[PDB]
Amino acid sequence: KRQVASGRAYIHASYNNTIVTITDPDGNPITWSSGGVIGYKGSRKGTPYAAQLAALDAAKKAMAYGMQSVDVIVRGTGAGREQAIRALQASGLQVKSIVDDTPVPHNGCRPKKKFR
Amino acid sequence: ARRRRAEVRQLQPDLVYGDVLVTAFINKIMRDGKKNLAARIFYDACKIIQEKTGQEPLKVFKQAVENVKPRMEVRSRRVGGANYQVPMEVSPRRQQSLALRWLVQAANQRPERRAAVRIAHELMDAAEGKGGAVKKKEDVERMAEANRAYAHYRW
Amino acid sequence: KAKVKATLGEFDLRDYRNVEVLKRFLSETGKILPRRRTGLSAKEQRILAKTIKRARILGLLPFTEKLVRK
RNA sequence: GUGGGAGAGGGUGGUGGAAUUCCCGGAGUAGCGGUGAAAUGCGCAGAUACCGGGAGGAACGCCGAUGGCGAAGGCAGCCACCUGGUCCACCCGUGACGCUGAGGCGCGAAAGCGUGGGGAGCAAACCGGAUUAGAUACCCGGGUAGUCCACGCCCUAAACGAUGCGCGCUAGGUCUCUGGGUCUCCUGGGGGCCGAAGCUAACGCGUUAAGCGCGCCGCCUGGGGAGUACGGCCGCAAGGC
Numbered sequence: 001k002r003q004v005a006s007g008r009a010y011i012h013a014s015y016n017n018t019i020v021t022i023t024d025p026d027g028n029p030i031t032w033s034s035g036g037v038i039g040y041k042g043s044r045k046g047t048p049y050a051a052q053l054a055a056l057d058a059a060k061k062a063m064a065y066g067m068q069s070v071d072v073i074v075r076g077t078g079a080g081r082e083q084a085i086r087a088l089q090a091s092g093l094q095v096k097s098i099v100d101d102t103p104v105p106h107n108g109c110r111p112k113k114k115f116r
Numbered sequence: 117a118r119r120r121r122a123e124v125r126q127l128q129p130d131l132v133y134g135d136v137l138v139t140a141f142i143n144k145i146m147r148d149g150k151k152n153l154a155a156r157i158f159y160d161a162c163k164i165i166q167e168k169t170g171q172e173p174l175k176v177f178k179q180a181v182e183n184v185k186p187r188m189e190v191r192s193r194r195v196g197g198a199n200y201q202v203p204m205e206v207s208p209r210r211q212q213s214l215a216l217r218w219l220v221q222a223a224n225q226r227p228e229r230r231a232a233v234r235i236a237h238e239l240m241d242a243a244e245g246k247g248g249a250v251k252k253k254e255d256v257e258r259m260a261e262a263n264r265a266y267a268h269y270r271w
Numbered sequence: 272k273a274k275v276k277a278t279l280g281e282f283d284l285r286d287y288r289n290v291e292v293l294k295r296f297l298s299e300t301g302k303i304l305p306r307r308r309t310g311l312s313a314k315e316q317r318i319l320a321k322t323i324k325r326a327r328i329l330g331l332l333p334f335t336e337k338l339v340r341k
Numbered sequence: 342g343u344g345g346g347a348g349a350g351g352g353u354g355g356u357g358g359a360a361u362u363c364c365c366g367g368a369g370u371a372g373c374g375g376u377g378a379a380a381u382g383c384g385c386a387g388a389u390a391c392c393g394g395g396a397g398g399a400a401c402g403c404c405g406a407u408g409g410c411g412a413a414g415g416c417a418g419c420c421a422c423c424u425g426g427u428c429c430a431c432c433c434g435u436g437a438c439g440c441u442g443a444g445g446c447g448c449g450a451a452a453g454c455g456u457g458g459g460g461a462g463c464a465a466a467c468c469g470g471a472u473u474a475g476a477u478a479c480c481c482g483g484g485u486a487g488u489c490c491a492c493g494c495c496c497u498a499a500a501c502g503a504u505g506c507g508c509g510c511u512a513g514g515u516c517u518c519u520g521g522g523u524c525u526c527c528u529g530g531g532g533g534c535c536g537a538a539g540c541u542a543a544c545g546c547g548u549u550a551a552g553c554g555c556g557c558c559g560c561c562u563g564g565g566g567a568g569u570a571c572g573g574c575c576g577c578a579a580g581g582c
């Protein structure tokens with residue numbers, strides 16, 4: 001009900017899940033999907049297959065609002081990070097550009113024991 | 117086969133059809149090393165398929181074997197504790213042994229009394245897309261594309 | 272590949288305000304390139320690091336950037 | 342003395358961007374999170390993911406080094422002021438003014454103590470969830486002291502090169518930081534690696550000695566009992582010598 005037709009797709013890939021948000025060119029989201037939004041429940045969310053179906057579900061959801069062009073933004077290291085992009089290219093949405101914007105601190109906050 | 121590649125056995129061409137796939141199918145019918153009995157089964161089963169159907173038993177045999185070939189299957193692989201059913205393609209050689217073994221196994225699950233009756237009826241049903249053997253094939257390709265979530269463990 | 276000192280003129284390593292040459296020392300991201308890629312000496316690199324950080328506070332050099340690939 | 346040098350050496354004030362958390366707004370649904378699997382947890386009072394604004398605390402990515410500085414502990418954003426050590430060139434000045442150093446005095450990571458602040462992230466204890474034969478644990482979700490600041494204590498350490506300080510002497514080769522030079526190189530002062538002679542039980546050390554000598558301080562004399570008991574000094578206590 002908006003007819004945006006061009007916008008951004010953020011891929012948030014972590015080792016436990018991949019989730020995709022699709023926004024208008026000034027950043028406000030339109031639709032979204034994830035490994036949990038499609039059927040998967042447990043550790044299967046952080047699989048590349050889930051990443052595929054997640055990207056594709058958010059892709060078809062953005063078709064409804066009439067999207068064609070997409071600027072891909074990627075954050076995180078995770079399985080199916082590449083597998084989710086490859087899904088977005090094939091989804092029919094023309095992929096304008098791809099940028100990796102993973103936030104790395106300049107060593108400011110003490111990490112949980114897991115990450116030291 | 118730890119050292120070598122374990123070359124494939126080259127079977128004798130058929131006495132009747134001159135086809136090696138026939139002999140290989142005859143051998144799966146054989147039990148206790150009675151190849152004479154197992155041939156008379158298959159060939160008498162070719163009379164059945166060619167009378168009850170006005171077609172060439174050779175082409176139906178192949179067309180049946182083709183419909184039972186599985187394009188994918190699942191195997192197990194030990195990963196982080198308990199293992200997983202991993203989908204992966206089927207070698208063209210393994211599609212041979214599996215389709216042939218399944219056809220013989222399916223036909224002997226059949227109601228029909230005599231052996232050659234069961235072979236012919238199975239081959240016919242298999243070539244038409246039904247019958248017990250095509251079930252084992254359609255059920256295997258269902259394991260893959262269900263565990264499709266583990267296509268990254270290809271190995 | 273070439274090194275940055277190899278393809279450049281005679282420049283002031285201490286002038287924090289000259290962006291055209293200082294920009295040639297950052298990477299695709301705002302990162303300060305290693306000596307392997309700047310061709311600088313041990314002492315020259317120490318001076319570059321400090322001048323680049325000065326230019327970053329004046330708003331002339333970027334602290335970090337976004338990679339357009341992958 | 343003069344003229345030059347390099348440096349996360351110290352103290353004080355100021356300041357910059359990235360990131361985490363929290364709050365405000367926008368947009369936006371059904372989950373997020375987490376693991377070997379999970380579950381507790383959080384989410385329809387709208388989370389996660391996304392854009393914008395703000396607050397606050399802590400630590401400085403790249404540069405970054407096998408690098409540098411310091412007596413040791415230890416020292417990394419940037420700026421300014423106050424300040425210590427140190428090296429080189431000149432051969433100018435004093436004229437043995439030196440070395441070490443029981444006692445004393447000061448410094449002394451982390452943890453811990455007191456008083457008053459601060460409190461984002463992390464996190465003993467603790468509260469849960471899992472695992473398990475059990476789980477007083479490893480893994481997961483929370484979380485207080487604490488970690489940070491000021492002022493005052495505490496004085497331990499694998500405080501390690503497990504190698505006290507200074508001086509002289511005894512093949513070289515090679516990598517390096519920083520000076521000076523008539524700048525393939527020479528010559529100092531550091532930091533490394535091979536290795537002459539020699540030493541060493543062996544490993545190994547070898548112009549940065551574990552070689553050859555000299556001066557001075559500390560210290561050892563089988564293991565357990567035991568860094569315990571007693572006494573003394575110190576400490577608010579923990580405790581230390």
Ligand SMILES: [Mg+2]
Pocket residue numbers: 016017041042043044045046
């Ligand atoms: Mg998961």
Ligand SMILES: [Mg+2]
Pocket residue numbers: 105106107108109
């Ligand atoms: Mg960090």
Ligand SMILES: [Mg+2]
Pocket residue numbers: 110
């Ligand atoms: Mg910390």
Ligand SMILES: [Mg+2]
Pocket residue numbers: 107108109110111400
């Ligand atoms: Mg940190």
Ligand SMILES: [Mg+2]
Pocket residue numbers: 114115116
């Ligand atoms: Mg780690």
Ligand SMILES: [Mg+2]
Pocket residue numbers: none
């Ligand atoms: Mg993380």
Ligand SMILES: [Mg+2]
Pocket residue numbers: none
């Ligand atoms: Mg990391």
Ligand SMILES: [Mg+2]
Pocket residue numbers: none
């Ligand atoms: Mg890592």
Ligand SMILES: [Mg+2]
Pocket residue numbers: 115116
């Ligand atoms: Mg670490």
Ligand SMILES: [Mg+2]
Pocket residue numbers: 115116
């Ligand atoms: Mg790490």
Ligand SMILES: [Mg+2]
Pocket residue numbers: none
């Ligand atoms: Mg086992």
Ligand SMILES: [Mg+2]
Pocket residue numbers: 194197198199
């Ligand atoms: Mg197993």
Ligand SMILES: [Mg+2]
Pocket residue numbers: 192198199200
């Ligand atoms: Mg199993």
Ligand SMILES: [Mg+2]
Pocket residue numbers: 198199200201
């Ligand atoms: Mg399994």
Ligand SMILES: [Mg+2]
Pocket residue numbers: 343433
């Ligand atoms: Mg003079």
Ligand SMILES: [Mg+2]
Pocket residue numbers: none
């Ligand atoms: Mg300093």
